Amino acid sequence: TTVDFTLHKIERKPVQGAQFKIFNVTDAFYQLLENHDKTTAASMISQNLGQYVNLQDPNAATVTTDADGLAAFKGLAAKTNGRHSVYAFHEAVTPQPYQKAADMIVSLPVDLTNIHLYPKDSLVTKNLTEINEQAVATKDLHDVAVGDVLTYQVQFQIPHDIGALAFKYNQFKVLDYMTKEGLTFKALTAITVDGQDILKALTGKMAFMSSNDAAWQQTHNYPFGFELDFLGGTDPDAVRNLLTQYAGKRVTVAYTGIVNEKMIPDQKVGNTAEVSFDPDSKITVNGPEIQTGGIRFFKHEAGSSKSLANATFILQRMNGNVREYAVLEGVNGMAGTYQPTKITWTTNQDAATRLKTSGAETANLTIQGLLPGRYTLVETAAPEGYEILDPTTDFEVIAGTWGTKTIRIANTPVN
């Protein structure tokens, strides 16, 4: 009825600061057991854990590694609804410069009370390193605004025997993609190994494709992505010679992506990097999730539920002492539902974008692409026939959603 898990994060060197989260996936596992083997289930959850769990669940117990790189999870249940429990583990945030461990899983009993796990790192790794050229923390979930330039790094090892004849290696694929929309591929910014950029040597010598290319949609299904084959370009030989002199070393592929107006809230969007040396064998990792914010209002005649169009608003934010006001690009000829390509901020309120209500029934002013935190909707004009009731409506964009509810705002009829 009771078990313990002692996690040991080490990378020779122990690692303090790494936070782990435990997930009970007992019933998620036994669901797959109907269609699948124990091994196929065990791996499926380990591979794509976020498919089976909310990875940022508050209730999922979380602990941080101490000085010794050690993290206890005391007193777990052995059973779970008449099944021997199966628990999954996930490194939620990692300190610099360390990498994110693989998402390991265990099925009970094995019996053993004090169970010591040692979460090793994945053979492919992905991170969100920067947002608008400013470094962020390595964590499983990042909240984003529309028009943000996101910088990703996919890291993987070169085989020790890369220059073998048997040539042995004629393919070094690197495939990144997202299943759901939200990003557009901006650019490949570097390919570094041994802290030295080899992108200039490789350009015009690899195969390289992305979402922006006409050849992508016929060959790949996905809205965002890029494919990169080192040994499948116009000069595979020279590119193999280049890689052999860094045989064993860790290549990092950096690229930028732009958050677009198809990115919607209530939708966490991950990416997946796949590395393959042949069509037979792939090593693969899922990056961190990203989500954006939004909010809905209902402008109405006081007392009734009468929707009032052409009530003008500006969105206000605090920057410590400083008031700032939203400037929405890509919203020429929109009203009610605003789906901007970039929300940027100004201290001059005369320059701020005037948001006008539509007169739709359910909610007649929506904004997407917002960061979470506190805001204030300021009514600059009531529609003709109505005076303003309360000039400011302060609210909170909840992290990754449309909010807990649509915010009703009343106008007073003059007659």
Residue numbers in the entry: 37 to 47, 66 to 164, 171 to 226, 233 to 481
Pull verbatim passages from the article behind this deposition.
The tertiary organization of GG-SpaD is a tandem assembly of three Ig-like domains, wherein a middle domain (M-domain) joins together the N- and C-terminal regions (N- and C-domains) of the pilin subunit.
Due to this repositioning, the overall length of the GG-SpaD pilin is shortened to 90 Å and the total surface area is reduced to 19,679 Å2. Compared to the interface interactions between the closed N- and M-domains, the open N-domain has lost most of these contacts. Instead, it has established a new interface with the middle and C-terminal end of the M-domain (628 Å2) that involves nine hydrogen bonds and four salt bridges. Some regions of the open N-domain structure appear disordered, e.g., the FG loop with the short β-hairpin and the AB loop with a salt bridge (Glu52-Arg66) covering the linking Lys180 that is now exposed to solvent. Because Asp181 has shifted about 5 Å away from Lys45, isopeptide bond formation is no longer possible between these two residues. The crystal packing of the open conformation revealed that the single GG-SpaD molecule in the asymmetric unit lacks a linear pilus-like structure. Since this offers a unique structural perspective to backbone pilins, we suggest that the open conformation represents an intermediary snapshot of the backbone pilin during its sortase-mediated assembly into the SpaFED pilus.
